[PDB]
Each structure stands twice: as structure tokens, then as C-alpha cells.
Design a protein around this ligand. Sequence first.
Ligand SMILES: [Mg+2]
Lengths: 98, 49, 108
Amino acid sequence: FIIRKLIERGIVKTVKSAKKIIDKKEPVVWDILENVLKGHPVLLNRAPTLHRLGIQAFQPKLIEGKAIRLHPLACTAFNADFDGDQMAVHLPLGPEAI
Amino acid sequence: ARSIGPYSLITQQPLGGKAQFGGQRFGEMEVWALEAYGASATLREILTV
Amino acid sequence: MQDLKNTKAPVSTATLNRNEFDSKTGNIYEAISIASKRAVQINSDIKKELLEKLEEFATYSDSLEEVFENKEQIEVSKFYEKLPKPHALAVQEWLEDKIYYRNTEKDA
DNA sequence: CTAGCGACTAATTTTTCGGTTCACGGTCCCACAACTAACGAC
DNA sequence: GTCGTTAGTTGTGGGACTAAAGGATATCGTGAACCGAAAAATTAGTGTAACGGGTATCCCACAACGCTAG
RNA sequence: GAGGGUGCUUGUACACCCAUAGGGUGAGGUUAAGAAUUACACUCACUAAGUGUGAACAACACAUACAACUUGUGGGAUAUACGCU
Ligand SMILES: [Mg+2]
């Protein structure tokens, strides 16, 4: 999606240049990603998935650090505490999936 | 985090492990949850594409 | 093509009332199917419009390695970036009873 | 309207490794095969 | 007295045993001798310079006037 | 099918034709041979080409698209094909 926006903006014309720009971590990448995130939820999952509430869609926002920020009220659904638990993020692609 | 990366030469599926730049496992229980929600499209994308 | 400068669809995700969403069909799965198909159509229309807009600012620069900063192209892309996504536009269309749907098997 | 005037390519040889040959003192559960003690018929 | 039948063991065999991450290992024993195969290395043999016209192209410089009389 | 003719000049392509045109020949000198005859990268020269009108190998009228349109003269130099050693 960032590559699509980079090509559309005229910054680059090929996929490889867009990938290089993304890997360089430029401010344009974050400017694109802020709008790319909107309306594109991610499925968060904690294993074991005992019931269907173990997979839940959340609208993501960019945050600092390397840890996923999870709403406390969802913890009971995930059986998730914050003593070292880990979560997986899956990105739906098609409009019907979103 | 992985968007695309190395795949297996046998199963043609994403590898597993940070060192291998692999992808997360959507196991049987996750498929059960997806079926319970009724997401045919999300399950189909996870299974095939 | 609908007016993309005055759309009321939410920019980001919102908690939509399912009772309103599936009132017309009696099934939220059917509503999701219809809205997703309309979203595909809306995405095609938006892509065509954006390509038409971008063809104007097609500065013919043969060099590829150098990064070119065309302000007008960036402005157009920025305008189309902050728009509601096609599925959001389809949802807003569906809630406003602006989607026409029919079943070929049932009508045959 | 015209004329005067300011050294590379082909042929032959040689050698290390592989092939061949000879061949005397835990658990729990569900089925399947025996199987046997008792029961009924000639 | 003897033979087939049925039910209840009894021993034996085949099949199950969350999910997420990760994911490094070490691996004996010896009998000889000759022939064939092909892959590789070493060795043996031949050589130009300017010229006539005539004409294709290049670089390099210059021109592409003005006036008077019969 | 190259290459050409007319479509102002050049380039591309284009309609219409010519095109064994790297061919069909003519004359002069020379050479070889008993002759017929052959020969010359010896010399010079001729011969094909849009439509209509027009007796006409007279003349006249008509005949596609884009781009370009500062040339001519000379000198120096290089190379190509051919001939001789
Ligand atoms: Mg924990």
C-alpha cells in the first residue's frame, strides 16, 4: 500500500525504488502510512484460540516502541495478561475481508 | 513483521521463524474462530492467496 | 461518480449498528456481500478518476534513479489519500439506500 | 543590359580411480481372534 | 455319550494424546591385485608493404562586390 | 524484391508505374586465334518509368503525409573496391 501511494505521488515509478525508500525510513513513509492505516483494521490473535473472541479486529494507529498496545477491556476475551504474553497480527487485504 | 518473504520448496508456504523471515501460523483453532465469525473472505485469503 | 469532496462516510473505522446495517436484507452476511461488491466498483471508479487526474501532471522525465518532487502530483495523491476507503463509501451508500442489488438465480 | 575596373589451434599421449575377481580350517480405549464352560440335539 | 452353539471372558493388536516460539548435534570395524576408462597436457605447425587512377567520407578556411560607361 | 521516374530540394513513408537497370545495347582503339569468334576495371555514348486532353516519343492541365531546408568552392587527410609485385 505504501508502494502504491509512493508510485501515485510520483516519487518513484518502480517497486524496487519504493522498497528502498521504505527501508530507508523516510518521513514520507510515515506520512503515507498514517492515511494508509485508516479504515484498514488488523486481526489480533492470542494462542490458544479457545473461542472466536481470540481473533478480533482492531483499527491500528502508529505508536513508538516495538510492543503492540492492546485495549485492557479486550484482555478478558483473549485471556491475555501483560506478564510476557505475545500476540499475532494478520492484515486483511480484500474489501470483503476488511 | 513479514509482508512477503521466503517460501518452502515443498509446501510453497511461508517459512517459520524470525531468522528465516517467516510468517505467523494460522492454525486450526484460528480457522475455527474465522468460521464461527462467518468470514468466508478472510479465511479464503488466509488459505489461498 | 459521486461527489468525493462532500462524502459523509467515516475516514477511519467506526462502530456501526448492525441492526441498521442488516435491516434491509435480514442478513448481515448478505449486506456485507452487497457492500463489498459495491466497494469493488467504487474502487474501480476511483482508480479511473485518479489515473485521469495524474495523466495531466505526467512530467516526461527519462531519468529513473533520481527522485522527482512534483508538487501537483503529490497534492492530487494527498487529496485522494484522505478520502474514505471504498468499503467505507460502499457502507455509506448502503445505509443511505443508494445501492441496487438483485439475485439472478431468484429472478430466473 | 553588358563589359571594364578598383602465438593459436589441432592432434596425440599418459596417468589415477573405479570396476572386477578370488573365494576353509506408558495410558486408555475399541476391536479381533481364541476359547471354554455350559446348553441343547441325535 | 457325543457334537455344534452361544455368551462371556482373556490375550493381543491398532489408534488418540491444546495452542504460540525454536529448531545446534554424530555417526567404528579394511582384502589384494590387475585392467580398463577417460580426462588431461604437451607438442608441432605458418608470417607483408605500397602502389595507379577514381571516388566515398571527414576537418578546415573562405565567399556569397560595387560603380561607370556605351 | 532491392534500386529507381513524375509528386519544388533533402529524409522517411506514401499512392501510379519502370525495374533480369549490379541490364539491353552501339561505335572507336587495342589484343588473341587459321577462321568463326572472344576479349579489355580500355574510351565515349544511347535505351524504362503517374492520369487526362491531345493523331502523336509535341505541348498543356491535374497528382500523398510529417520533418527540415546556408549552401557553394577549394585545400589537407583517411578509407573502401579493383589492378600489379
Ligand atoms: Mg501471561
